[PDB]
Amino acid sequence: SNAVPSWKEAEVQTWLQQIGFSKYCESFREQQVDGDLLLRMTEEELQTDLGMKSGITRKRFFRELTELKTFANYSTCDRSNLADWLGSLDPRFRQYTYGMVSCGLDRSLLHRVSEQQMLEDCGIHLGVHRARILTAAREM
Amino acid sequence: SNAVPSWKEAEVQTWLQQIGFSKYCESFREQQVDGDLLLRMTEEELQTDLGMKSGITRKRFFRELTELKTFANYSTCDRSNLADWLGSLDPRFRQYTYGMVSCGLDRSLLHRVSEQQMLEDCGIHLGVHRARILTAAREM
Amino acid sequence: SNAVPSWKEAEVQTWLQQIGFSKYCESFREQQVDGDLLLRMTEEELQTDLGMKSGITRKRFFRELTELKTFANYSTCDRSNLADWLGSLDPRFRQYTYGMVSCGLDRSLLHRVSEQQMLEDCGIHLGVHRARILTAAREM
Amino acid sequence: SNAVPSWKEAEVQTWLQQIGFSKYCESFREQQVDGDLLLRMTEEELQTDLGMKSGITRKRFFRELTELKTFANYSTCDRSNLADWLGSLDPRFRQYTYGMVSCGLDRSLLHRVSEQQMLEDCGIHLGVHRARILTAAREM
Amino acid sequence: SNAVPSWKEAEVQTWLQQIGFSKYCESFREQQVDGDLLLRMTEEELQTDLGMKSGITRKRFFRELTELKTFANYSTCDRSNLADWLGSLDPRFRQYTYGMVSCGLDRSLLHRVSEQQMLEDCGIHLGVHRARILTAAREM
Amino acid sequence: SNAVPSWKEAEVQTWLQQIGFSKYCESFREQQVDGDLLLRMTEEELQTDLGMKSGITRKRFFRELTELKTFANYSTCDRSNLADWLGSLDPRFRQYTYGMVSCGLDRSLLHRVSEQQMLEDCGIHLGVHRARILTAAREM
Amino acid sequence: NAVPSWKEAEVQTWLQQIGFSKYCESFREQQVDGDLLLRMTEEELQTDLGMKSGITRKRFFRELTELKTFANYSTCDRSNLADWLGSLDPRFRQYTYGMVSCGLDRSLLHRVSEQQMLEDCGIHLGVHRARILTAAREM
Amino acid sequence: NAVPSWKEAEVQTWLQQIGFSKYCESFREQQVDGDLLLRMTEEELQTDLGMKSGITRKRFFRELTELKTFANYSTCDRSNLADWLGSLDPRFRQYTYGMVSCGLDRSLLHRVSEQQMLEDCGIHLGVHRARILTAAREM
């Protein structure tokens, strides 16, 4: 299955095993992590609520989570095809699709987005990424 | 029933079971949570006063609470139909109805509201949402 | 009786019973809470000095206290009838009467009050409320 | 006797009995509180040094102390009759007499006093009160 | 004796007895407090090094120390008769003589002294006092 | 093999032995450190997650890691040959290749990079280095 | 009298001459000589030398300030910075070693900022910094 | 004499010649060589080498400043930055390794800011930063 936003708990459990994170399978089930929560996973939630203590292990997790976000199918929630707009700018920018869609952004609104909003609301932590997406949104 | 602002404890208890939160039923009853308190629920009250320690569980709770706020009937307290003004801007903006109505806002007053008031007093935490409501309130 | 500013401990004890807060009768008795102290009640005093640990219980209390402050008779201390001026502007504003009257405000002085003074001295915590009262004070 | 500035420890003990604060008599005795210290009392001293833990009890104490300060005899230390100048402006302003006389203010010097000085040096905590005293002092 | 700057431990021990502070005699003796240290006594030194925990007791101490500083003989260290310059402005300003003389000030230098220097270096904590001394220094 | 970006855990373990850090082999294996994590290693990760407590030992580690980063094989991930651009500017600058490539920079994008981005996102901690790279990017 | 040239023995003798024999061995185990004595900080007294009492520390700096004021700095003050400070005010001579230690001289005085005098030279009294600044600029 | 090229043996010998034999085993267990010795910070001495006393650390940096001042930097300073700093003021030669480590030379000095000398080169004295900056601009 590829529609990560529509994933239930079972689909997340399978993904943890294919990425070598069987250690955290039961934790993700007692917390009832589904696709929506997995795509919005934060550094604090991994450490405190899921028991992922090592910062290096967390960095491995976000490495795999970024890979999943990059090749996910967002058609069921991305009406303006925001994913392929980010992808046409740079392939690694497709990971930010669900973050921008969760706070109600689309192609029509990109020119009104500020860099702080991309940080606080969309979860775009890399400044170089914010700078290129911000600039590309202005030249439309 | 659908008029959440008018909900008594029984309606909150039924709603908690329909969303799979029976585990927290007695906590919501000992605290005597009704519709007004449920609509004004903060993250600290869930953690401290209702025993919902997991931040992931809280995010699931606010996921269900945001959907309830979005499709609730506010006729008994929103006389200026502020809900449909928010809804016509974006369906997900309807959740902020009770927050704005609780601090005495209506359509007549929207153009005089600042973003700090929307953050501190109305509870609109997403910056993109505050910016969009501000712009629409000014075009009148 | 209804003149809360003139209430002694007996009237406060009766009011707690009528709002279902008999559980906190004994606490309000050892602290000797009368009408003046009840009208100037703060959240910190409820938590620390009266033993109201739950923030949800405190929010219910201020819900009832706001109802009492809104429909109280302030004739014994409000010489300029500031209560009905606030009330005619918005029903929710009549609760702030005792706070403004305690620091010596009246209709004659309202136009000289700043928004910070309303927060620090009168206890108007909602920014939208301060903004509306300030504007109305200037239109006279 | 009413000349609080000239009070020794005996007169303070009598006053504590007249306001129902016999519980704190011995604390005021070992700390050797006289009239000068009573008129300059701060909340931190009540809490830490006199053992008055309850914030509600402290608010009751300052209620009695403010009435004592308002109707006190300042003949022995108020050389410019600053008390009757404050009182003629507003009866509630007479409480600030000793705080202003202790740092050497008089009628001659009032126009040179800033609002920051009234807070830090004179102990006028209410902002609305500081603003009214400033305005009246400059219009002389 | 009145020339406090020349006091050794014996004169300080006697002064503590005449003001009713015999309880702290031993502390002042083991710490070897003489006249110079007594005139430069700070609140931190009383609390930490001399065991004066009560803030009310410290306020009583500085009440007596201010009385001693006011009527002291500064002939042995005040070449410009700075004491009588302060005294002619206001009698209680004479207490600040040793503080200003210790940092090398005199009448010749008064006109370039700033309000921060009077606070940090001379120990004039009352703002109203600093404002009048500043004004007098510029009118020379 | 010199292509550190493609290194697996086995290649990292071999490198630790060649630099005399066999003591930390087990830590690097339980944390599953590969080439990508090794090139992005931070001082906080060494101390907290890998047990390298001594700051002097950590400084020795970064000495060896900087040597590895300087002469590494970037053919598998450096599409614009950014390493040889940095190297032609100064040999010590080649260490920053993976940091810039990890956030997707290339020769085409260098002129749009700010000094804050080189610090927060690329990991160029030396200010003199950031200043020289920024200047060279502008002269193109 | 050449405090900058003092070895540990001279510091031990001076501690006895000012009534601080109680702290003699502490200054000995820490190997305090003239250079360290002239650069003594309050944190070093409390933590490393065991002088817990802040009042005792104030007595120490009272005696140390007298020593700094009348010391002979000829062996390290080539521009006679001590007598420049002294002509401005006798008590300003104590700051000589602090200013000489960070490489200052008369040639450099007009280029010194007040923050440099606070952080680097150790002139903590603001009134003193203001007076030295004014005199350094009028040259 | 070439401190940048010193291995652990030379550091152990230097500690003995300065009377710091007490800390020989610490410098050996931490494997301190010439490069680490020249980049020694106060935090590393206190936490990692066990030098608890702040006075002992000040004595150490006193000797380390002597070593840094008279070291031979030919093996890493091709622009002879050491003798440029030294000719400006003898105490400035210690900053050679700190500046050479971040790739600076005479050609680059005029582009260095005062903040860079603090954060990157380790020139903690403000008066020193001000003097080097001014001299670097007159070239």
UniProtKB/Swiss-Prot annotation, chains A, B, C, D, E, F:
Changing residue 75 to A: Does not affect phosphorylation level. Changing residue 108 to A: Does not affect phosphorylation level. Predominantly expressed in brain, kidney and liver. Expressed at lower level in placenta. It is found in: Cytoplasm; Cell projection, Axon; Cell projection, Dendrite; Synapse. Residues 7-71, 81-140 form the SAM domain. Changing residue 56 to D: Reduced ability to form an octameric ring and promote axonal degeneration following injury. Induction: Up-regulated by lipopolysaccharides (LPS). The TIR domain mediates NAD(+) hydrolase (NADase) activity. Self-association of TIR domains is required for NADase activity. Homooctamer; forms an octameric ring via SAM domains. Interacts with TICAM1/TRIF and thereby interferes with TICAM1/TRIF function. Interacts with MAPK10/JNK3 and SDC2 (via cytoplasmic domain). NAD(+) hydrolase, which plays a key role in axonal degeneration following injury by regulating NAD(+) metabolism. Acts as a negative regulator of MYD88- and TRIF-dependent toll-like receptor signaling pathway by promoting Wallerian degeneration, an injury-induced form of programmed subcellular death which involves degeneration of an axon distal to the injury site. Belongs to the SARM1 family. This is NAD(+) hydrolase SARM1. It comes from Homo sapiens. The gene is SARM1. The chain holds residues 409 to 545 of 724 of the full protein.
